[PDB]
Amino acid sequence: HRIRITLTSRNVKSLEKVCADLIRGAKEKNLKVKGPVRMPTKTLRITTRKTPCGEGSKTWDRFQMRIHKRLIDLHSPSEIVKQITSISIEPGVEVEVTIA
Amino acid sequence: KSYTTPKKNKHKRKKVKLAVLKYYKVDENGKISRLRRECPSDECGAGVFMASHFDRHYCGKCCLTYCF
Amino acid sequence: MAVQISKKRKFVADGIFKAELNEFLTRELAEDGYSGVEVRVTPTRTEIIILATRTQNVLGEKGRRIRELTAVVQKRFGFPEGSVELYAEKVATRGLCAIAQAESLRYKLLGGLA
Amino acid sequence: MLMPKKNRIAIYELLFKEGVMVAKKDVHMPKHPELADKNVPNLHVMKAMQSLKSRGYVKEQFAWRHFYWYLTNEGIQYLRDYLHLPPEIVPATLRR
Amino acid sequence: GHQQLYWSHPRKFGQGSRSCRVCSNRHGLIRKYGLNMCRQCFRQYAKDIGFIKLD
RNA sequence: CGGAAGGGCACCACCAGGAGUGGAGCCUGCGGCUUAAUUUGACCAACACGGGAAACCUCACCCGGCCCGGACACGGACAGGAUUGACAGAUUGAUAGCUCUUUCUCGAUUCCGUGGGUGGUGGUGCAUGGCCGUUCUUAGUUGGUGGAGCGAUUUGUCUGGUUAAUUCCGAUAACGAACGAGACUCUGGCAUGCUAACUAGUUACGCGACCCCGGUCGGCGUAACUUCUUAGAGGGACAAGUGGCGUUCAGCCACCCGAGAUUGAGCAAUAACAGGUCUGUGAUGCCCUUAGAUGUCCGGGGCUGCACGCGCGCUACACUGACUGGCUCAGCGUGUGCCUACCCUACGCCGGCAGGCGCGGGUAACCCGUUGAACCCCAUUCGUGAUGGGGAUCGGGGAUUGCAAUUAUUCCCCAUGAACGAGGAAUUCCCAGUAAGUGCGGGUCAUAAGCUUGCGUUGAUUAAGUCCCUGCCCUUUGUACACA
Ligand SMILES: [Mg+2]
Ligand SMILES: [Mg+2]
Ligand SMILES: [Mg+2]
Ligand SMILES: [Mg+2]
Ligand SMILES: [Mg+2]
Ligand SMILES: [Mg+2]
Ligand SMILES: [Mg+2]
Ligand SMILES: [Mg+2]
Ligand SMILES: [Mg+2]
Ligand SMILES: [Mg+2]
Ligand SMILES: [Mg+2]
Ligand SMILES: [Mg+2]
Ligand SMILES: [Mg+2]
Ligand SMILES: [Mg+2]
Ligand SMILES: [Mg+2]
Ligand SMILES: [Mg+2]
Ligand SMILES: [Mg+2]
Ligand SMILES: [Zn+2]
Ligand SMILES: [Zn+2]
Numbered sequence: 001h002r003i004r005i006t007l008t009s010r011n012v013k014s015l016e017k018v019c020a021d022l023i024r025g026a027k028e029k030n031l032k033v034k035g036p037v038r039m040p041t042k043t044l045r046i047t048t049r050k051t052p053c054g055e056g057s058k059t060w061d062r063f064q065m066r067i068h069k070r071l072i073d074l075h076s077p078s079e080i081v082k083q084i085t086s087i088s089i090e091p092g093v094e095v096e097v098t099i100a
Numbered sequence: 101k102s103y104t105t106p107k108k109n110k111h112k113r114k115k116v117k118l119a120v121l122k123y124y125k126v127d128e129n130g131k132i133s134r135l136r137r138e139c140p141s142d143e144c145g146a147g148v149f150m151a152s153h154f155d156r157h158y159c160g161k162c163c164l165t166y167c168f
Numbered sequence: 169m170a171v172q173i174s175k176k177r178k179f180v181a182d183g184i185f186k187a188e189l190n191e192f193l194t195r196e197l198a199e200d201g202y203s204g205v206e207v208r209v210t211p212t213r214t215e216i217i218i219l220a221t222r223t224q225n226v227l228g229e230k231g232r233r234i235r236e237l238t239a240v241v242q243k244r245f246g247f248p249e250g251s252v253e254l255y256a257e258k259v260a261t262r263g264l265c266a267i268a269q270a271e272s273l274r275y276k277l278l279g280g281l282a
Numbered sequence: 283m284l285m286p287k288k289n290r291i292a293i294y295e296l297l298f299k300e301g302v303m304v305a306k307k308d309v310h311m312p313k314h315p316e317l318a319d320k321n322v323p324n325l326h327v328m329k330a331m332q333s334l335k336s337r338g339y340v341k342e343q344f345a346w347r348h349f350y351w352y353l354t355n356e357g358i359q360y361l362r363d364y365l366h367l368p369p370e371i372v373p374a375t376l377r378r
Numbered sequence: 379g380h381q382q383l384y385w386s387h388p389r390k391f392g393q394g395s396r397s398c399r400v401c402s403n404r405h406g407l408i409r410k411y412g413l414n415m416c417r418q419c420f421r422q423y424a425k426d427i428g429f430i431k432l433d
Numbered sequence: 434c435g436g437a438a439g440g441g442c443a444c445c446a447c448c449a450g451g452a453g454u455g456g457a458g459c460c461u462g463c464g465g466c467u468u469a470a471u472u473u474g475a476c477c478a479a480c481a482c483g484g485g486a487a488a489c490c491u492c493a494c495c496c497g498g499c500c501c502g503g504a505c506a507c508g509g510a511c512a513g514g515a516u517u518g519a520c521a522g523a524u525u526g527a528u529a530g531c532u533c534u535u536u537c538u539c540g541a542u543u544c545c546g547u548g549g550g551u552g553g554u555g556g557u558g559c560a561u562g563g564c565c566g567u568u569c570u571u572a573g574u575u576g577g578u579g580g581a582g583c584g585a586u587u588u589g590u591c592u593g594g595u596u597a598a599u600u601c602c603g604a605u606a607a608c609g610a611a612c613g614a615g616a617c618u619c620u621g622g623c624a625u626g627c628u629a630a631c632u633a634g635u636u637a638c639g640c641g642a643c644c645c646c647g648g649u650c651g652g653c654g655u656a657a658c659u660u661c662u663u664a665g666a667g668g669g670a671c672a673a674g675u676g677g678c679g680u681u682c683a684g685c686c687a688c689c690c691g692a693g694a695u696u697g698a699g700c701a702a703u704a705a706c707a708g709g710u711c712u713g714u715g716a717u718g719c720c721c722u723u724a725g726a727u728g729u730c731c732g733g734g735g736c737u738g739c740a741c742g743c744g745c746g747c748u749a750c751a752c753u754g755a756c757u758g759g760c761u762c763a764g765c766g767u768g769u770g771c772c773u774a775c776c777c778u779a780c781g782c783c784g785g786c787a788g789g790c791g792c793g794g795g796u797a798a799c800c801c802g803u804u805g806a807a808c809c810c811c812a813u814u815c816g817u818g819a820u821g822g823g824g825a826u827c828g829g830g831g832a833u834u835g836c837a838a839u840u841a842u843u844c845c846c847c848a849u850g851a852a853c854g855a856g857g858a859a860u861u862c863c864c865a866g867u868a869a870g871u872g873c874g875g876g877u878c879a880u881a882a883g884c885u886u887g888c889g890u891u892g893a894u895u896a897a898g899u900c901c902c903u904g905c906c907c908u909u910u911g912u913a914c915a916c917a
Binding site: 283285290307308309311315328329333335337338345346347 | 501502504505506516517518539540541542543550551715729772
């Protein structure tokens with residue numbers, strides 16, 4: 001009954017769209033919510049020599065992947081949150097909802 | 101290029117004419133025994149034949165060497 | 169997942185999935201105006217959308233080649249049967265896709281136009 | 283290829299049932315991945331369908347590390363009259 | 379025998395055990411996060427993976 | 434292009450300087466020599482570069498031995514058998530039936546010739562694509578129509594002022610535009626106001642341990658809260674305000690207010706080099722090789738070889754120091770993998786140590802981890818002696834990883850104690866949380882940082898300038914230069 005939702009994406013604006021939509025969905029189906037907690041953004045950083053060969057000035061790309069993850073807690077039954085998570089998700093955001 | 105030390109030749113398989121004939125023996129009527137010993141192999145009951153080599157028995161499929 | 173893959177290599181694993189999917193569809197459907205893909209996932213099935221120009225030919229006779237390369241995608245990526253589905257859609261405003269125009273230029277050069 | 287004809291007709295059965303077939307560019311697979319039942323190496327599988335494509339009954343693609351083979355209509359002719367199969371049966375790509 | 383000889387050498391570690399995910403190439407791999415592809419083809423496909431040059 | 438002039442600009446330039454490098458040992462790379470081979474690309478913009486820390490693999494080089502992975506077609510020979518595999522025993526390195534001899538199975542898949550493909554880290558980067566580097570980190574570049582000239586061309590794109598800027602004000606045979614600069618994105622710095630938090634906490638409150646009402650606790654639980662932590666939306670700074678300087682335009686200096694009154698990167702035009710890459714590719718033209726293979730594999734060796742030369746670096750030459758105790762502070766990150774077999778580790782025991790053996794946590798704001806990191810701070814001992822500086826070389830032993838360490842992989846223990854007394858000619862990087870000192874993570878990785886990429890931490894001397902040397906941009910001028 002303390003069912004938790006985690007939202008994880010490479011994108012920030014789509015993720016926060018989905019989280020605010022789920023907050024308003026929980027509000028319209030009339031149940032309390034501990035808010036979207038924001039755990040720190042994981043960076044995946046890659047530095048590679050830009051050159052295919054060996055020569056050149058020794059230059060380096062700095063590639064990054066930002067991953068945002070947020071949490072929503074709901075004291076509610078199961079099919080309510082199952083039908084709210086069956087709708088209104090962007091393709092970039094991964095949703096993982098666990099019961100315990 | 102050139103290489104003066106001679107090469108290895110390919111092992112040509114020895115062409116033999118109707119070597120299946122030498123496994124059984126023939127009488128004019130129904131008296132047939134087997135020249136080559138049979139196998140207690142698990143894959144083959146009594147189908148394939150062993151060999152009687154230069155002195156001593158061997159089967160090639162199951163690869164079982166029966167010795168003195 | 170029981171092997172329980174981590175999120176850091178999960179996002180680069182499905183990124184590299186979308187990369188080889190795009191490059192596979194590029195090497196196959198370059199003759200027929202393959203513009204791109206969009207991969208969007210639900211529970212128990214996953215909608216993957218090829219977005220191209222000549223939808224009649226990416227379907228084929230009766231829809232043979234779409235079923236053909238759904239079988240190809242499932243067999244190659246180890247997807248369960250009927251757990252992913254390929255839909256093919258038309259490019260809106262075909263002229264602006266630099267992929268499709270580079271391929272049209274490539275087939276003009278291969279057909280022999282100056 | 284000195285191919286077990288058992289395994290070659292098995293690969294033809296895979297190609298016919300799952301109407302097209304993929305494989306890894308890896309001659310040193312210990313065993314082929316698509317089937318868990320039989321015992322056929324991916325080397326045998328690769329050179330078998332290269333023998334298929336050289337006379338033109340299957341068409342090839344190669345992405346990153348995986349061969350892709352698509353069975354043409356002349357190939358479905360050759361495959362059914364080779365497998366001695368009557369024309370009521372069709373591949374799963376043709377089933378709708 | 380040749381069945382016990384042909385690929386008899388262990389591929390459990392080193393350069394030749396791993397290989398490039400796109401090239402069958404053994405040099406300049408990046409194993410971090412399990413990309414397992416060479417750096418040239420990585421920086422080819424990097425924007426399609428998601429590694430965007432923020433700075 | 435000028436060792437011609439006028440303007441400007443840059444610590445890849447200089448001045449004031451700082452740390453040095455060049456001198457020593459060692460590591461690594463390159464040249465040479467040597468060798469069966471000690472493969473090879475590159476000689477500001479090569480040389481700790483090819484992410485190139487190669488025991489096997491990589492491996493391409495060398496010595497040997499296997500295999501076809503020579504499709505497909507044509508034509509042979511063939512089930513009266515085309516032809517795979519084969520333990521003995523010899524030979525061999527190998528139990529490679531590789532070859533010899535004796536022979537058993539396999540059953541149309543295959544062999545034998547001719548075309549033809551295929552593979553190639555084989556050649557050509559001076560046939561190429563892609564990508565990077567460089568010209569070139571400066572402010573440069575181009576059409577349309579109009580003007581000038583026969584024309585190549587020019588004007589626009591400029592006398593002047595101004596700026597980091599072809600940035601603007603402004604002049605005006607040019608007008609209206611495009612790219613570059615800027616704008617932009619990420620980062621940094623500031624919000625006690627917003628959003629909220631058992632994967633972060635604070636404050637209280639109640640139990641618990643201890644000290645002579647109060648104090649300590651990173652001891653246990655809950656009632657408020659989000660300042661600290663996380664990250665979202667907004668804000669916030671604009672030369673805006675003031676005083677001068679300037680056509681009182683563009684704008685410059687200073688000062689109050691202020692978290693900031695120039696934080697750092699990314700992106701980056703036209704045109705070009707015969708700069709690098711065919712050794713990143715299933716991107717590739719052509720050539721060459723194609724069963725005695727330049728294909729692939731296995732065994733071993735080499736990529737490390739030392740009269741020598743050069744380059745990037747680490748350790749040092751000590752008392753501002755070494756050694757031995759003690760005390761007390763980080764931020765990046767990463768972590769059980771498709772194939773893929775190898776993860777990060779608390780904790781309990783054993784061992785001086787490297788390490789060994791068990792039960793546990795963690796696919797991660799949860800567990801390692803409150804990351805108890807070093808220089809640093811404090812207290813000893815040493816005493817200007819190649820010395821308790823320095824730790825090269827080298828002998829003997831003990832572990833770990835591997836399938837295997839010998840040409841010592843890596844680490845541990847004892848012993849050995851060299852040069853090196855602040856480095857000639859020359860030369861590099863740099864101006865604020867910067868230089869330098871210091872240690873920690875990623876890549877490489879089975880083992881693994883003298884490298885590199887990031888990160889904090891202690892943290893300054895000097896400078897707010899110039900065209901002197903090295904160069905860059907604009908204008909004028911000269912040219913017998915145009916592969917300049
Ligand atoms: Mg300056
Ligand atoms: Mg100086
Ligand atoms: Mg020197
Ligand atoms: Mg020196
Ligand atoms: Mg080797
Ligand atoms: Mg080898
Ligand atoms: Mg090649
Ligand atoms: Mg060139
Ligand atoms: Mg060249
Ligand atoms: Mg020749
Ligand atoms: Mg080397
Ligand atoms: Mg010492
Ligand atoms: Mg090594
Ligand atoms: Mg001494
Ligand atoms: Mg200099
Ligand atoms: Mg290196
Ligand atoms: Mg003159
Ligand atoms: Zn038997
Ligand atoms: Zn690659």
